[PDB]
Tab-separated table of C-alpha atoms and ligand atoms in Angstrom:
chain	number	residue	atom	x	y	z
A	1	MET	CA	105.160	64.256	183.385
A	2	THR	CA	101.456	63.580	182.935
A	3	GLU	CA	98.978	65.695	184.919
A	4	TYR	CA	96.443	63.570	186.788
A	5	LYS	CA	93.304	65.379	187.916
A	6	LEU	CA	92.050	64.054	191.264
A	7	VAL	CA	88.775	64.910	193.012
A	8	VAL	CA	88.251	64.245	196.729
A	9	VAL	CA	84.729	63.308	197.857
A	10	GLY	CA	83.184	62.537	201.234
A	11	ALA	CA	81.004	63.763	204.078
A	12	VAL	CA	81.718	66.719	206.349
A	13	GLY	CA	83.828	65.657	209.305
A	14	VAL	CA	86.069	63.141	207.552
A	15	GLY	CA	88.692	65.819	207.047
A	16	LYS	CA	89.348	65.684	203.321
A	17	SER	CA	91.630	68.715	203.384
A	18	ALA	CA	93.414	67.272	206.420
A	19	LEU	CA	94.136	64.151	204.371
A	20	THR	CA	95.610	66.329	201.639
A	21	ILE	CA	97.817	68.479	203.880
A	22	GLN	CA	99.122	65.323	205.571
A	23	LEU	CA	100.278	64.148	202.133
A	24	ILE	CA	101.339	67.357	200.383
A	25	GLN	CA	103.417	69.158	203.013
A	26	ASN	CA	102.936	66.316	205.496
A	27	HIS	CA	101.142	68.246	208.240
A	28	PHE	CA	98.056	67.488	210.334
A	29	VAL	CA	95.354	70.009	211.197
A	30	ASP	CA	92.657	69.586	213.865
A	31	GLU	CA	90.587	72.613	212.851
A	32	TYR	CA	88.062	72.331	210.028
A	33	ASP	CA	87.755	74.783	207.145
A	34	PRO	CA	85.023	74.764	204.440
A	35	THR	CA	86.937	74.447	201.176
A	36	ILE	CA	85.570	75.355	197.738
A	37	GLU	CA	88.198	75.164	194.995
A	38	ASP	CA	91.974	74.834	195.065
A	39	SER	CA	94.691	72.583	193.674
A	40	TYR	CA	97.168	70.543	195.664
A	41	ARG	CA	99.396	70.072	192.649
A	42	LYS	CA	102.397	68.044	193.753
A	43	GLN	CA	104.676	65.707	191.813
A	44	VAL	CA	104.913	62.112	193.025
A	45	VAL	CA	107.338	59.382	191.947
A	46	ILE	CA	105.278	56.313	191.082
A	47	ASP	CA	106.793	53.172	189.534
A	48	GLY	CA	109.885	55.243	188.841
A	49	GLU	CA	107.901	57.848	186.908
A	50	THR	CA	107.389	61.302	188.414
A	51	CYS	CA	103.794	62.313	187.714
A	52	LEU	CA	101.906	65.485	188.653
A	53	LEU	CA	98.916	64.955	190.902
A	54	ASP	CA	96.256	67.670	190.756
A	55	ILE	CA	94.290	66.918	193.915
A	56	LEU	CA	91.210	69.110	194.188
A	57	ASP	CA	89.293	69.145	197.466
A	58	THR	CA	85.678	69.786	196.548
A	59	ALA	CA	83.072	71.353	198.809
A	60	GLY	CA	81.382	68.838	201.077
A	61	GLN	CA	78.362	71.105	201.278
A	62	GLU	CA	75.522	70.626	198.805
A	63	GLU	CA	75.425	74.229	197.614
A	64	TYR	CA	77.309	73.989	194.319
A	65	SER	CA	75.370	71.382	192.314
A	66	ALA	CA	75.793	73.505	189.184
A	67	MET	CA	79.567	73.849	189.504
A	68	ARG	CA	79.762	70.219	190.644
A	69	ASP	CA	77.972	68.764	187.606
A	70	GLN	CA	79.894	71.206	185.403
A	71	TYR	CA	83.482	69.960	185.242
A	72	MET	CA	82.678	66.610	186.889
A	73	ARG	CA	83.440	65.096	183.479
A	74	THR	CA	87.052	66.170	183.991
A	75	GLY	CA	87.243	64.201	187.234
A	76	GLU	CA	89.875	61.582	186.478
A	77	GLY	CA	90.904	60.177	189.845
A	78	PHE	CA	88.063	60.158	192.344
A	79	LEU	CA	89.203	60.019	195.958
A	80	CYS	CA	86.418	58.324	197.877
A	81	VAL	CA	87.485	58.142	201.508
A	82	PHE	CA	85.055	57.276	204.289
A	83	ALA	CA	85.375	57.253	208.068
A	84	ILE	CA	84.250	54.727	210.675
A	85	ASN	CA	83.072	57.593	212.876
A	86	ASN	CA	79.945	57.823	210.737
A	87	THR	CA	78.060	54.815	209.390
A	88	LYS	CA	76.151	57.004	206.926
A	89	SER	CA	79.378	57.429	204.965
A	90	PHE	CA	78.948	53.767	204.018
A	91	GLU	CA	75.593	54.602	202.414
A	92	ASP	CA	76.744	57.878	200.838
A	93	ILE	CA	79.047	55.760	198.666
A	94	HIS	CA	76.097	54.570	196.574
A	95	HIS	CA	74.935	58.161	196.131
A	96	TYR	CA	78.370	59.160	194.879
A	97	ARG	CA	78.532	56.090	192.625
A	98	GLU	CA	75.313	57.013	190.833
A	99	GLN	CA	76.498	60.607	190.500
A	100	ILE	CA	79.927	59.663	189.140
A	101	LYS	CA	78.816	56.871	186.782
A	102	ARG	CA	76.132	59.165	185.356
A	103	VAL	CA	78.646	61.828	184.316
A	104	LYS	CA	81.418	59.338	183.520
A	105	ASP	CA	79.186	57.508	181.014
A	106	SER	CA	81.083	54.334	181.883
A	107	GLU	CA	80.786	51.515	184.410
A	108	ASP	CA	84.510	50.821	184.296
A	109	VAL	CA	86.568	53.244	186.354
A	110	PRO	CA	89.937	52.816	188.143
A	111	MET	CA	89.059	53.563	191.747
A	112	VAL	CA	89.793	52.135	195.194
A	113	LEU	CA	87.902	52.054	198.476
A	114	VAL	CA	89.873	53.520	201.356
A	115	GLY	CA	88.749	53.731	204.948
A	116	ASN	CA	90.375	56.309	207.197
A	117	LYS	CA	90.205	57.338	210.867
A	118	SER	CA	91.647	54.000	211.999
A	119	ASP	CA	93.017	55.843	215.028
A	120	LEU	CA	89.513	56.018	216.472
A	121	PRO	CA	88.339	53.340	218.977
A	122	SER	CA	84.828	53.478	217.488
A	123	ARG	CA	84.434	51.200	214.474
A	124	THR	CA	80.885	51.352	213.120
A	125	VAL	CA	82.014	49.543	209.955
A	126	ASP	CA	83.885	46.219	209.919
A	127	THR	CA	86.467	45.012	207.398
A	128	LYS	CA	84.347	42.146	206.015
A	129	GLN	CA	81.394	44.370	205.140
A	130	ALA	CA	83.732	47.074	203.830
A	131	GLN	CA	85.477	44.661	201.466
A	132	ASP	CA	82.126	43.131	200.512
A	133	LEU	CA	80.673	46.385	199.205
A	134	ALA	CA	83.979	47.151	197.480
A	135	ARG	CA	83.807	43.832	195.633
A	136	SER	CA	80.283	44.613	194.429
A	137	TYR	CA	81.747	47.755	192.871
A	138	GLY	CA	84.760	45.907	191.506
A	139	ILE	CA	87.186	48.054	193.465
A	140	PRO	CA	89.919	47.074	195.984
A	141	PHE	CA	89.549	48.078	199.641
A	142	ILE	CA	92.516	49.443	201.612
A	143	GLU	CA	92.772	50.704	205.195
A	144	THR	CA	94.337	54.129	205.700
A	145	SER	CA	95.325	56.039	208.820
A	146	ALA	CA	96.305	59.636	208.029
A	147	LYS	CA	96.708	60.586	211.702
A	148	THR	CA	99.612	58.172	212.139
A	149	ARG	CA	100.610	58.203	208.455
A	150	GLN	CA	99.931	54.510	207.831
A	151	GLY	CA	98.804	52.912	204.579
A	152	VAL	CA	99.046	56.263	202.816
A	153	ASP	CA	101.813	55.242	200.399
A	154	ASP	CA	100.464	51.704	200.062
A	155	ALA	CA	97.005	52.879	198.973
A	156	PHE	CA	98.355	55.604	196.687
A	157	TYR	CA	100.827	53.356	194.848
A	158	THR	CA	98.189	50.731	194.049
A	159	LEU	CA	95.706	53.400	192.906
A	160	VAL	CA	98.034	54.755	190.216
A	161	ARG	CA	98.702	51.201	189.043
A	162	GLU	CA	94.950	50.703	188.588
A	163	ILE	CA	94.543	53.955	186.639
A	164	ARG	CA	97.403	53.150	184.253
A	165	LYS	CA	95.787	49.733	183.758
A	166	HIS	CA	92.589	51.385	182.537
A	167	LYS	CA	94.482	53.842	180.345
A	168	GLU	CA	96.811	51.407	178.561
B	201	YVW	O1	93.856	75.965	190.360
B	201	YVW	C1	93.288	74.912	190.068
B	201	YVW	C2	91.941	74.579	190.709
B	201	YVW	N1	91.654	73.142	190.601
B	201	YVW	C3	91.777	72.741	189.193
B	201	YVW	C4	91.213	71.331	189.001
B	201	YVW	C5	90.259	71.014	188.131
B	201	YVW	C6	90.030	69.710	188.263
B	201	YVW	C7	89.155	68.845	187.624
B	201	YVW	C8	89.126	67.500	187.975
B	201	YVW	C9	89.980	67.022	188.962
B	201	YVW	C10	90.861	67.890	189.601
B	201	YVW	C11	90.886	69.233	189.247
B	201	YVW	N2	91.605	70.263	189.687
B	201	YVW	C12	93.250	72.753	188.793
B	201	YVW	N3	93.893	74.039	189.155
């Protein structure tokens, strides 16, 4: 069982921790709580192989730049999830890209673009534009709805396949 280190990134309001709880113990929370450092270490069966996923929900607040740039080199699987409730999240992607690539020292990284909050009637970002920006990054775009548990498995299964492709 290989341990995969995952780092969740995104703006405040997207509910990163909520997305984790809905996957780990499969529970949804409406309340928001400022997370700092933890480890949602759960084993998942992918392609018939049970792997250990070390999902770490990082602080969405810009008050730990030192700690952030510290072990950012250990960030294997970056979880970039954006919401349609905020259009700025579509711009924040570029900021994250420059931050990640800089510490990764590589332009090639197994990552996917997932859009959540598809249970909201307000769509500030369309599918065409979403896929377009994803293509410019060389990453696949998938729609995910944590609230109704849709596309969660689909997006996760493909992600692992991409990572293994980069590894071997
Ligand atoms: O108790 C803990 C706290 N989080 C640690 C962690 C470090 C790390 C680096 C990169 C991606 C995910 C990561 N998770 C693991 N165990």
